[PDB]
Structure 1
């Protein structure tokens, strides 16, 4: 006779909690600091000496002017960012790899992040796994990793590459560019559509910056704290 009121309290607190959580987002954050810029909004330009390179110039936004938003229209569109403001990137690309030549099965993706005053900022490598002719999808793999083979490839052959806090960019610059060159052999890189670059504002305070980093973890912990305090106060 009480679990109904328990659910009523859930549907009162949880919605109120997310509302107060967005209130904290509104006050603590400007609510438009971060800006997820998908790779497909850059200007792709392939090559052989260098792999796929994504580049896109930068427009400098005078202070006071409302900040535009990088719409995921997949259309090329300049990155917005305050001229007099430090910005800290978060490269988040996930991709598939594939090759007609049954040359190699595991390879090393090289990532270079230049900027332009031409001047390299960040370079790393990540051992990516690559499809090949002699790869077959076992029946048990289809049973366990979801019946849809696209979901199986997502679970098994997709290779996420997260780069956090390692890149910093000034709006006084322009024409950021990210290279992706597989090094051992030519490969077909299938960049997952939801791969982007989170342009953060890099507050001089560690805790709020970490909260901006771990958005989903904050979605967990802040909602949990709100629910617990509200329910304990009411009880």
Structure 2
């Protein structure tokens, strides 16, 4: 097994190539905890946060995942793509309708213009719902693990929202169209701001960072093996 000592020399150079081609400041994950929350009844919940624009050569800071309201940093003359990663629990307070429709509306700063709308059917927990002991044995003994693997509504929206730093505010509206529910947003829910590169492949690599490392470390094995043949 001589492949174990040479694979670090491949992963290090691939990591250096990835950071050279995709800088670390090209993507920013902004959790919804860092937004401002406005709860209503005719619009659901509102996730609005102002945008701060910094000039070139200013070392774009990252968003601290501390749950505090922070301005979203974006490069001034740059166009960003938004990846909405939303995980939430729906809990029926009334009418116990087990399946509902979640309305997702994205606005930007003549008051606010809507730039994205979508619907996602979501399963909602009812008081009559019970958890069988078969699910405990298979889906992990922990009740929270069973709820996460069974009732957690995961909503991913990538490469569909375009935002410019010239706009001052961005708002996200979440509403259920059938009945009022208790929406528990998972703390890992957030919006990832990606720089939209014109090379095409870089945008795909940003969206698939985990898959990109696997493909890169599997495709450098031919470079590793070609020096063996010579």
TM-score, length of structure 2 as denominator length = 0.94
Q: Distance in 2 between matches of 1:17 and 1:159?
A: 38
- 151-160 or 19-28: which moved more? 19-28
Any conservation in 2 of the 1:25–1:31 contact (CA below 8 Å)? no
Distance 1:228 1:97, change over 3 A: farther
Q: What do you get for the CA RMSD once the two structures are aligned?
A: 1.4
Distance (Å, rounded) in 1 between the aligned partners of 2:107 and 2:146: 34
Separation of aligned partners in 2, 1:154 and 1:231: 43
Question: Within 1, Cα distance between the matches of 2:178 and 2:227?
Answer: 61
Name the CA distance, whole Å, in 1 between partners of 2:95 and 2:80: 42
Task: Classify the secondary structure of the residue corresponding to 1:10.
Answer: coil
Q: Deviations over 1:77-96 (max 9, x none)?
A: 00000111111111111111
Who is 1:114 aligned against? 107
SS in 1 for 2:9: helix
Task: Quote how far apart the aligned CAs of 1:146 are.
Answer: 1.0
Maintained 8 Å contact 1:53/1:180: yes
Cα distance between partner residues in 1 of 2:177 and 2:137: 35
Q: What does 1:153-164 align with in structure 2 at a 5 Å threshold?
A: 153-164=147-158
**1:13–1:227 contact (8 Å) kept in structure 2:** no
1:78 aligns with 2:66: no
Paired residues, number: 227
Contact map agreement 1:111 1:123 (CA 8 A) in 2: yes
The unaligned stretches of length 5 or more in structure 1 are 1-7
Offset at residue 100 of structure 1 (A)? 2.5
Moved runs in structure 1, 4+ residues, more than 6 A? none
How far residue 16 of structure 1 moved from its aligned partner, in angstroms, is: 2.2
Structure 2, unaligned stretches of length 5 or more?
Answer: none
Deviates more, 1:94-103 or 1:150-159: 94-103
Distance 1:228 1:181 in 2: 51
Residue 39 (structure 1) aligned with residue 22 (structure 2)? no
Query: What displacement does 1:130 show?
Result: 0.6
Question: 1:30: Cα distance to partner?
Answer: 2.0
* Distance in 2 separating the partners of 1:9 and 1:43: 54
Q: 1:228 to 1:158 in 2, by over 3 A?
A: farther
Residues 31-50 of structure 1, C-alpha deviation per residue, up to 9 Å, x if partnerless? Answer: 21000111111011111001
